[PDB]
Design an enzyme around this catalytic site. Structure first.
Site, PDB file in Angstrom:
ATOM      1  N   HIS A   1     -10.704  19.086  72.843  1.00  0.00           N
ATOM      2  CA  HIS A   1     -10.082  20.374  72.527  1.00  0.00           C
ATOM      3  C   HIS A   1      -9.910  21.636  73.557  1.00  0.00           C
ATOM      4  CE1 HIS A   1      -8.638  23.752  69.503  1.00  0.00           C
ATOM      5  NE2 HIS A   1      -7.872  23.013  69.299  1.00  0.00           N
TER       6      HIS A   1
ATOM      7  N   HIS B   1      -2.867  31.662  67.713  1.00  0.00           N
ATOM      8  CA  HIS B   1      -3.552  30.089  68.181  1.00  0.00           C
ATOM      9  C   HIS B   1      -4.783  30.482  69.068  1.00  0.00           C
ATOM     10  CE1 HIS B   1      -3.941  26.069  70.016  1.00  0.00           C
ATOM     11  NE2 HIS B   1      -3.761  25.845  68.736  1.00  0.00           N
TER      12      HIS B   1
ATOM     13  N   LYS C   1      -8.885  23.694  76.889  1.00  0.00           N
ATOM     14  CA  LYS C   1      -7.562  23.860  77.408  1.00  0.00           C
ATOM     15  C   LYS C   1      -7.942  24.799  78.937  1.00  0.00           C
ATOM     16  CE  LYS C   1      -5.331  23.530  72.971  1.00  0.00           C
ATOM     17  NZ  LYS C   1      -6.665  23.499  72.414  1.00  0.00           N
TER      18      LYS C   1
ATOM     19  N   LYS D   1      -8.441  32.082  69.858  1.00  0.00           N
ATOM     20  CA  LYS D   1      -9.742  32.152  69.183  1.00  0.00           C
ATOM     21  C   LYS D   1     -10.667  33.168  70.062  1.00  0.00           C
ATOM     22  CE  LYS D   1      -8.231  27.748  68.303  1.00  0.00           C
ATOM     23  NZ  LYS D   1      -6.947  27.130  68.868  1.00  0.00           N
TER      24      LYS D   1
END
Length: 439
Positions: A119, A335, A121, A337
């Protein structure tokens, strides 16, 4: 005839001298003042950021045709390494997407724990002039940079350490060694060259701390290397009585039958470390999604299932609405966090974390074997902003840290429900006049 770039410079896009270098992505459909100061992926890959030699794109979901188009024509043939976690059919499809572009190579990050994902990025961008690291929250697809609220941390341009010279190139936040350790954890042959690139550069100006999750079962002092124990350690070392803790995320995992199983016991415990605390969780309500720029389809990127939700209704009393008047983004579904520790009057904060980690045991880790092992399923990455890193004791809100949503958070109303993606909403149409009926 004028040079096309005459009169534009990188400081038209970046905020010179700002110590945070925390940006939001551009949002289509909002007033221009809300996108001044924002960044699109084309901006980050612009020739003004540096003369590109090669790049590595760590992510979860990729649209390769779209990705290549975001690089300036002149850089579209430079080597790109896509680092992903797909297997079998998914993996085959990613290779087929990349096949037309001979400059693109792929690195499959190992996922040896069930149900884990890659996950993280991040972009590693190597230039003639140096290196840039970008840690962010968006997938490499058009929709994630269109109408969502996303976050981006941009490193300074790191110069190359001269041939024949030796120095550590390390920052006071240990970001260089920490990023090298994160990459080394993949045990990926294709990342060796990138680890060497980092070794060759001077990252000493870095002022944030890296917070990674990588899959595994960590014991002893290794427990402090990753995810929520890593946050705990940094807060104990480098960081506030009844200051609340805020978490803000786009997806929720199964947290257990009550708040004592994990949420309040180990997760909140790590978050309230500094040197009855209120916990406020921000997650879009159904109404937030309904009236968003996208309408209900925004909910396709808020994957909270009814199967998960129905086992933890206790959690929903912690939920607060998505509100981002401050950044003109109340209708741009999150989107990004983030996690942070504001003062009771919300006028300052003790720290702020932007990351890819959602509110899940998979991402943050969960203790096993009577607290001796931390098990993490996934790769995640974020950066922590600590006032001590800037010679301060706290940041003011709006030395002032750009919090992208409104404070104080606003509690759900009695009629509000958390967005749950796989149940129908048929009583009120969305922004585009449609109902939501999955299946």
């Amino acid at each position: 005839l004028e040079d096309p770039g005459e009169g534009q410079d990188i400081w038209d896009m970046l905020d010179k001298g700002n110590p945070f270098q925390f940006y939001l992505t551009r949002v289509s459909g909002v007033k221009p003042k809300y996108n001044s100061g924002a960044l699109h992926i084309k901006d980050i890959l612009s020739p003004l950021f540096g003369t590109l030699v090669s790049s590595a794109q760590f992510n979860y979901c990729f649209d390769v045709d779209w990705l290549v188009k975001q690089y300036p024509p002149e850089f579209r043939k430079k080597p790109i390494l896509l680092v992903h976690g797909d297997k079998r059919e998914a993996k085959a499809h990613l290779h087929a997407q990349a096949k037309p572009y001979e400059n693109i190579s792929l690195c499959q990050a190992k996922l040896d724990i069930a149900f884990g994902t890659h996950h993280t990025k991040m972009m590693l961008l190597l230039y003639e002039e140096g290196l840039r690291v970008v840690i962010h929250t968006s997938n490499l697809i058009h929709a994630d940079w269109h109408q969502k609220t996303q976050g981006i941390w941009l490193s300074p341009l790191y110069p190359r350490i001269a041939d024949g010279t030796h120095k550590s190139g390390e920052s006071p936040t240990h970001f260089k060694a920490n990023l090298i350790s994160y990459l080394t954890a993949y045990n990926a042959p294709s990342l060796k060259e990138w680890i060497d690139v980092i070794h060759k550069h001077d990252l000493s100006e870095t002022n944030v701390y890296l917070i990674g999750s990588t899959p595994g079962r960590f014991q002893g002092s290794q427990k402090d290397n990753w995810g929520h124990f890593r946050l705990k350690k940094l807060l104990k070392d480098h960081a506030a009585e009844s200051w609340p803790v805020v978490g803000q995320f786009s997806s929720v995992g199964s947290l257990g039958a009550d708040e004592s199983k994990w949420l309040c016991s180990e997760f909140k415990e790590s978050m309230l470390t500094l040197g009855s605390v209120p916990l406020y969780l921000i997650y879009p309500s159904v109404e937030n999604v309904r009236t968003s720029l996208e309408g209900y389809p925004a909910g396709g990127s808020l994957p909270y299932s009814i199967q998960t939700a129905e086992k933890q209704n206790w959690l929903h009393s912690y939920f607060h609405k998505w509100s981002a008047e401050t950044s003109g983004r109340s209708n741009a579904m999150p989107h990004i966090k983030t996690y942070m520790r504001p003062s009771p009057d919300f006028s300052k904060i003790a720290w702020f974390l932007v990351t890819s980690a959602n509110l899940s045991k998979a991402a943050w880790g969960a203790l096993e074997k009577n607290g001796t092992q931390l098990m993490i399923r996934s790769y995640e990455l974020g950066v922590l902003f600590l006032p001590s890193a800037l010679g301060l004791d706290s940041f003011k809100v709006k030395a002032t840290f750009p919090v992208p949503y409104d404070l104080p958070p606003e509690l759900y109303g009695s009629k509000d429900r958390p967005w749950i993606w796989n149940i129908p909403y048929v009583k009120a149409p969305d922004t585009h006049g449609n109902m939501w009926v999955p299946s």
